[PDB]
Structure 1
Amino acid sequence: DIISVALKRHSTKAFDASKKLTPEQAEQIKTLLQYSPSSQNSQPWHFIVASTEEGKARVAKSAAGNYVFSERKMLDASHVVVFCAKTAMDDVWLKLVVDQEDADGRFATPEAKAANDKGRKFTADMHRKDLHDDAEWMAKQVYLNVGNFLLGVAALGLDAVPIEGFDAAILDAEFGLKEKGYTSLVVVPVGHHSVEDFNATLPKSRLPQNITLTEV
């Protein structure tokens, strides 16, 4: 029951480092990252999946200064996903996407492929050339991916925590992201919570719908 999943999931504050994802689960989480929807299927993202001691430690360099409380979550979880956005939308990426759709069998005719490409270029250009908000627009798609991911990992019976509390400059530098064309946005440790996870037992809290939700 997905509503049950949504109501029971929580942000894990402490992970049991001994409780790893199964091999299948580790593939499932990668599938969830890949299959998120995004505007124009633009998929403007890269993921770093850290599963080794060394790899997790590299990500954990970002939990410095104001962000030290994030460090243990990054080290102790089984798998840690760094969600990254492209820093600019380029035509090469646009072509990549449409060619992949063609390879996958989405276009019956050259005309259909060309109309798809034109539409995607129009939208991408509106953001980059006119609104000058392509970096934000791409970042929004990445956050959508995060939302899909958190629900999906809960539905697999896995714990996770989304983290904005990290130093993206440190994380980008550690992985050479800027030169590759990406920037780190959200870190999501995934695994199984320990008995020290005080948030596992605390009540969920949300604003009432009478504040947030209008029916018409």
Structure 2
Amino acid sequence: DIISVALKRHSTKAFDASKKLTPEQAEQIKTLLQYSPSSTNSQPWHFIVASTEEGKARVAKSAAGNYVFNERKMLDASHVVVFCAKTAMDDVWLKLVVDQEDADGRFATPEAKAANDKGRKFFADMHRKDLHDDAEWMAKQVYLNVGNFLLGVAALGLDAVPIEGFDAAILDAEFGLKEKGYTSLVVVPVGHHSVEDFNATLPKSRLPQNITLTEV
């Protein structure tokens, strides 16, 4: 029952470090990251999955200054996912995507592949050549991925918290992301909440539909 899932999930404020993902769950979260949809199947993303003490410590360097309120979450969760966007959309990536779609059997003819490549480049060029918003466009797809992910991990029976409160320059530097062509956007600790998670027992709150939603 996915509505039950959506209503019962919450942003976890404290994790029980002793409660690890099962081997299975650890693979299933990777599956979720991989299989998110994205505009033109552009998949303009990279994920860091930190499951070791050393790994999580490296990520937690980013919870500095104004962001110390997020350090323990990064340290204490079983697994921590860093969602990264490409910094620019290049033709090598676009060829990578269409070639993969071909390998997977999505095209019956050379003509169908070529039409798919043309359609993808129409959108990619709109953003990188005309609007000059390809960095934002790609970051949007990564956020869509995050939204898919948070509901998915909840449906697996796992706790999570999305985090924008981190220093992306520190995180990028720690993992050499800039030279690799990526930048960190959202950190998502995944695991099981502790009794210290004050948010597990508080009511959820949302604006009423009479403000946010119009039916036509």
Q: What is the CA–CA distance in structure 2 between the aligned matches of 1:30 and 1:69, rounded to whole Å?
A: 27
Q: Cα deviations across residues 88-142 of structure 1 (Å, max 9, x unaligned)? A: 0000000000000000000000000000001101110010000000000000000
TM-superposed CA distance for 1:207, in Å, is 0.2
Q: What is the CA–CA distance in structure 1 between the aligned matches of 2:161 and 2:123, rounded to whole Å?
A: 33
Q: Cα deviations across residues 69-103 of structure 1 (Å, max 9, x unaligned)? A: 11000000000000000000000000000000000
TM-superposed CA distance for 1:190, in Å, is 0.0
Q: Counterpart of 1:184 in 2: which secondary structure?
A: strand
Q: What is the CA–CA distance in structure 2 between the aligned matches of 1:126 and 1:163, rounded to whole Å?
A: 30
How many residues are paired up? 216
TM-superposed CA distance for 1:191, in Å, is 0.0
Q: What is the CA–CA distance in structure 1 between the aligned matches of 2:70 and 2:51, rounded to whole Å?
A: 17
TM-superposed CA distance for 1:164, in Å, is 0.1
Q: Counterpart of 2:187 in 1: which secondary structure?
A: strand
Q: What is the CA–CA distance in structure 2 between the aligned matches of 1:116 and 1:165, rounded to whole Å?
A: 38
Q: What is the CA–CA distance in structure 2 between the aligned matches of 1:33 and 1:123, rounded to whole Å?
A: 23
TM-superposed CA distance for 1:176, in Å, is 0.3
Q: Gaps (5+ residues) in structure 2? A: none
TM-superposed CA distance for 1:2, in Å, is 0.0
Q: What is the CA–CA distance in structure 1 between the aligned matches of 2:64 and 2:92, rounded to whole Å?
A: 35
Q: What is the CA–CA distance in structure 1 between the aligned matches of 2:104 and 2:172, rounded to whole Å?
A: 32
Give TM-score, length-normalised by structure 1.
1.00
Q: Counterpart of 1:189 in 2: which secondary structure?
A: strand
- 2:47 is equivalent to residue 47 of structure 1: yes
Q: Which runs of 4+ in 1 moved over 4 A?
A: none
TM-superposed CA distance for 1:13, in Å, is 0.1
Percent identity (aligned): 99
Q: Counterpart of 2:106 in 1: which secondary structure?
A: coil
Q: Cα deviations across residues 28-63 of structure 1 (Å, max 9, x unaligned)? A: 000000000000000000000000000000000000
For 1:1-216, list aligned pairs within 5 A. Answer: 1-216=1-216
Q: Counterpart of 2:205 in 1: which secondary structure?
A: coil
TM-superposed CA distance for 1:160, in Å, is 0.1
RMSD between superposed Cα atoms in Å: 0.2
Q: Counterpart of 1:190 in 2: which secondary structure?
A: strand
Q: What is the CA–CA distance in structure 2 between the aligned matches of 1:92 and 1:42, rounded to whole Å?
A: 12
Q: Counterpart of 1:97 in 2: which secondary structure?
A: helix
Q: What is the CA–CA distance in structure 1 between the aligned matches of 2:44 and 2:75, rounded to whole Å?
A: 27
Q: What is the CA–CA distance in structure 2 between the aligned matches of 1:64 and 1:134, rounded to whole Å?
A: 29
TM-superposed CA distance for 1:146, in Å, is 0.1
Q: Counterpart of 2:80 in 1: which secondary structure?
A: strand
Q: What is the CA–CA distance in structure 2 between the aligned matches of 1:17 and 1:69, rounded to whole Å?
A: 17
Q: What is the CA–CA distance in structure 1 between the aligned matches of 2:179 and 2:125, rounded to whole Å?
A: 22
Q: What is the CA–CA distance in structure 2 between the aligned matches of 1:17 and 1:123, rounded to whole Å?
A: 44
Q: Gaps (5+ residues) in structure 1? A: none
Q: What is the CA–CA distance in structure 2 between the aligned matches of 1:152 and 1:212, rounded to whole Å?
A: 24
Q: Counterpart of 1:204 in 2: which secondary structure?
A: coil
